[PDB]
């Protein structure tokens, strides 16, 4: 779930 | 400098041009084990009907707020369904008797640490429909997916307190932690699997 960095 | 970037790009580009991913893939649009009766069909988000994309933004709230809200990231309705309605958001949905919407994966083709990749960006059953290995199987799609349009990896990021899905992901799917995670150099990690 979602895009971390 | 540039030539290696544009042969990645092009991959990414030819790729988002693409009309039905599975077209060539028909037995991954059917998922008929431990009692689901499902169809799957791999559409860019402006194909979906919008009380489709409410459906799915609906489901990711209500299975993922409280883990945003226990990470660093919080929660906001409107950060995240910009994120699902991006021009660029493809998603895979499984409906069961081709009829309702169970689960859904929004991915895309794009550059990540200079490499094309396939990214999934959300992996969300229904609660009655979890522990009957759809969720493996969709996983399972997205690879192909990444072998077909020629991506080096399928990645995607999850949180250290979702255990469940952690321990699909790492255990039961053998992804690995990717270098860009952040425990490689926080609440989550960047999990990939090489094509
Ligand atoms: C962001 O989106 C990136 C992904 S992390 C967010 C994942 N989504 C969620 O956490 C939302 C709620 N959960 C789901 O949508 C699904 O349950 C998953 C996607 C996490 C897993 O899909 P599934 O339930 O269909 O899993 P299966 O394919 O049936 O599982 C196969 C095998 O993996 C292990 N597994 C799955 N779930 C596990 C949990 N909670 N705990 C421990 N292990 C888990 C099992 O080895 C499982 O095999 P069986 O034991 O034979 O069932
Ligand atoms: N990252």
Redesign the interface.
């Known amino acids: 779930?979602?895009?971390?960095? | 400098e540039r030539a290696a970037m544009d042969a990645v790009c092009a991959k990414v580009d030819a790729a988002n041009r693409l009309g039905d991913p599975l077209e060539a893939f028909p037995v991954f649009k059917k998922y008929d084990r431990n009692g689901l009766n499902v169809s799957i069909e791999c559409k860019r988000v402006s194909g979906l009907e919008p009380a489709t994309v409410d459906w799915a933004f609906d489901l990711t709230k209500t299975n993922m707020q409280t883990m945003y809200e226990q990470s660093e990231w919080g929660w906001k309705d409107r950060e995240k369904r910009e994120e699902m309605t991006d021009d660029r958001a493809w998603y895979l949905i499984a409906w069961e008797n081709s009829s309702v919407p169970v689960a859904f994966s929004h991915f895309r083709f794009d550059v990540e640490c200079g490499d094309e990749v396939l990214y999934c960006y959300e992996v969300q059953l229904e609660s009655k429909v979890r522990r009957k290995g759809l969720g493996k199987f969709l996983i399972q799609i997205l690879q192909l997916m990444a072998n077909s349009t020629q991506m080096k990896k399928v990645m995607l990021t999850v949180f250290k307190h979702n255990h469940g899905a952690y321990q699909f992901f790492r255990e039961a799917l053998q992804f690995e932690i990717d270098d860009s995670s952040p425990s490689m150099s926080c609440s989550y990690e960047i999990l990939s699997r090489r094509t």
């Open positions: 779930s979602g895009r971390g960095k």
